[PDB]
Amino acid sequence: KRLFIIKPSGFYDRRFLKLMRFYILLTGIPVAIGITLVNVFIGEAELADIPEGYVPEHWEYFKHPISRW
């Protein structure tokens, strides 16, 4: 026969975990999608020689677009 199981309250831990997951995901799903879209459509730069008489900007010495920005 079904008896009652005396446990401490699980409402508050569960609510905390849902809130933490919610906020972390709220801002971290857009970042994951943005990094994917950048990596797929923009991509990294390719190594090239410095053309004659040309002087690159300081950010043009890095290959990843996010690091460059």
Partner 1 sequence: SGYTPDEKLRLQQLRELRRRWLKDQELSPREPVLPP
Asked if 56 and 62 count as a contact pair (C-beta separation under 8 A), the reply is: no
- Pick the piece of the chain touching ligand CDL (CB under 6 A) from 1-9, 29-37, 46-54: 29-37
How many amino acids of this chain bind ligand CDL (CB under 6 A)?
15
- CA pair distance 24, 68, nearest whole angstrom: 26
Q: Least distance (Å) from partner 1 to the CB of residue 31?
A: 34
The nearer residue to ligand CDL, 46 or 52, going by C-beta atoms, is: 46
Assign residue 53 a region: left if phi > 0, alpha if psi is -120 to 50, beta otherwise? left
- CA pair distance 34, 4, nearest whole angstrom: 49
Q: Which of 13, 39, 45, 56 binds ligand CDL (CB under 6 A)?
A: 39
Q: Least distance (Å) from partner 1 to the CB of residue 3?
A: 5
